[PDB]
Write a structure and sequence with these properties.
This is part of a larger assembly, with 4 copies of chain A (about 170 residues). Chain A has about 170 residues and is mainly alpha-helical. Chain A has one domain (about 10-170): Ferritin (Up-down Bundle), CATH 1.20.1260.10. Chain A contains 5 helices and no strands. Chains in contact: A-B, A-C, B-C, B-D, C-D. The interface of A and B includes residues 118 and 134 of A. The complex binds chloride ion (4 copies) and sodium ion (4 copies). Chains A, B, C, D: Belongs to the ferritin family. Chains A, B, C, D: This is Ferritin light chain. Chains A, B, C, D: Pfam families: Ferritin (PF00210). Chains A, B, C, D: One of its GO terms (biological process) is iron ion transport.
């Protein structure tokens, strides 16, 4: 059982398990986005790489949460991972909009857990989120917003040209 | 407008713009202090360098605030920068006293913004200040207090000798 | 007071202080331009970097003037720094037009100070401006004019595409 | 005679020869100052080195003038070098005062030659002085003024202590 647990509420323990589920769901969503942009009839390598890198990032955030759960003496509990919301993700613009929606949902879940931690007087939890999650999320949302603006600027009357150019000249590819 | 802004109050946005103004005013004050100590009739190179380095530090703090404003989806708004409070800054002791007064005013503005952020349940803001500003300010005020004590010890009956020695043996020069 | 001052008119001393104010105002204008292009709803990194680099250049020109003021035995006097003329800067084309207007105003202030120096038979002042300011300004205005022409060529019927391409393929970014 | 001389007035030629004499006189004055501070009953090594370095600098300025005279097709004419104004130079403060008097006299001779060159429409002469002499002189006078202020600050009630400290902690020695 637990010889180490101290100042770690059941409420936080459960909310940490839920947040793990959210991050793993987000990782799965990004795996799907990545492989969609690798289709031969989509073929935007930079976009594929962007989302594959995010899949890895979100899995790593879940892993950090799970490590912390054990450091505090809580017990990891895993639930089913729901499949992503779509099977096909449309244009790069559609995809980047869906991504920022997903990130704002994760960000709100971080803020909600921070609020709970604050209410439970759990400063280690609050510090953990501040130190490893909140700014990383703000930076990522800023990046996505920058991308959305550039994608939107490029639609013009020539959407295919713009989608190609964005992939070639903004996103990282081989 | 804003596709990214989340949990970022208008109150904090405005107070961040005011704090930018305060840091840029402080930078300007230190530019003036630096060039005063470079006058041929003042000629304390170490003192000049101390204050020139602080001008740069304060500008860099303003720049970090402005970067954060954009990361959060707020809008930078610039106001006039008032000129420094003095044209001539007296002795090294007078200057270092004015500097610690200025730093305590910046520190209180940091604390006030932290309080606002706390009241607005904005943990990213609170973390940002804690991580990049509050300890830097405490360390700087401690340094200035150490300097004031050594300057004061050196006045004795021989103020010019003491002011020379402090500049030569404590402050960094070529 | 002054044990060093020689052949340095009160008229030049005052005009040097005014020119410092102009360069610091220009630096502030460029800080504002830079952060505007870093907004998530503007998001032109190359444009942001261009103007941030100019902010630094103009501050450095002010610092050189202030160093010279002290070398000559004049007294630096600082005035309020008025806020930039706009809070939002429009398109890259609008911004680059505003920049060349600002540079031509600085250039005329340089020429005016040169004329004063000439009239005061102050060859050190005249040399100083020729050696550190006049050609730097001519080169910068030429660069801006080259940029304006390329920006203008790119508007065509597809303004967003052109603004993206200019930022990606002419301006320096990561 | 002269196959090369072009746009080089007899007035400038003669004034260049006079300026050579002035620089060589100044060099001789600094040789005397240097050896005075090397006396066993004066013994301020840093002060000795300061003035010995200036002797070399002034000789080098004379040599540059003589090189230029020949480049223009004028004829070097040498006159007697009057001995320095004093045999003993008093305190470091007395010496540094005499040095700034001497430098302001050289500086005025530079400005006077510039005026003549301007009146003779001799832009190569004017450029030569601006490029190799006027700023070097301004920088040197600023340095001397900085030194005088520090020396003066150190007199206090304890002149010998202050003169030692200045030599040890400001001036370059082994
Ligand atoms: Cl489902
Ligand atoms: Cl004011
Ligand atoms: Cl204004
Ligand atoms: Cl004689
Ligand atoms: Na909270
Ligand atoms: Na607080
Ligand atoms: Na002119
Ligand atoms: Na002249």
């Amino acid at each position: 059982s637990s010889q180490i647990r101290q100042n770690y509420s059941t409420e936080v323990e459960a909310a940490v398990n839920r947040l793990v589920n959210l991050y793993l769901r987000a990782s799965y969503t990004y795996l799907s986005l990545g492989f969609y942009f690798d289709r031969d009839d989509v073929a935007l390598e930079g976009v594929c790489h962007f989302f594959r890198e995010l899949a890895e990032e979100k899995r790593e955030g879940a892993e950090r949460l799970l490590k912390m759960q054990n450091q505090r003496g809580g017990r990891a509990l895993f639930q089913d991972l729901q499949k992503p919301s779509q099977d096909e993700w449309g244009t790069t613009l559609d995809a980047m909009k869906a991504a920022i929606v997903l990130e704002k949902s994760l960000n709100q879940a971080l803020l909600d857990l921070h609020t709970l931690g604050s209410a439970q007087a759990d400063p280690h939890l609050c510090d953990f989120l501040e130190s490893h999650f909140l700014d990383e999320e703000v930076k990522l949302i800023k990046k996505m917003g920058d991308h959305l603006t550039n994608i939107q600027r490029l639609v013009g009357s020539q959407a295919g040209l713009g989608e190609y150019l964005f992939e070639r000249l903004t996103l990282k590819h081989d």
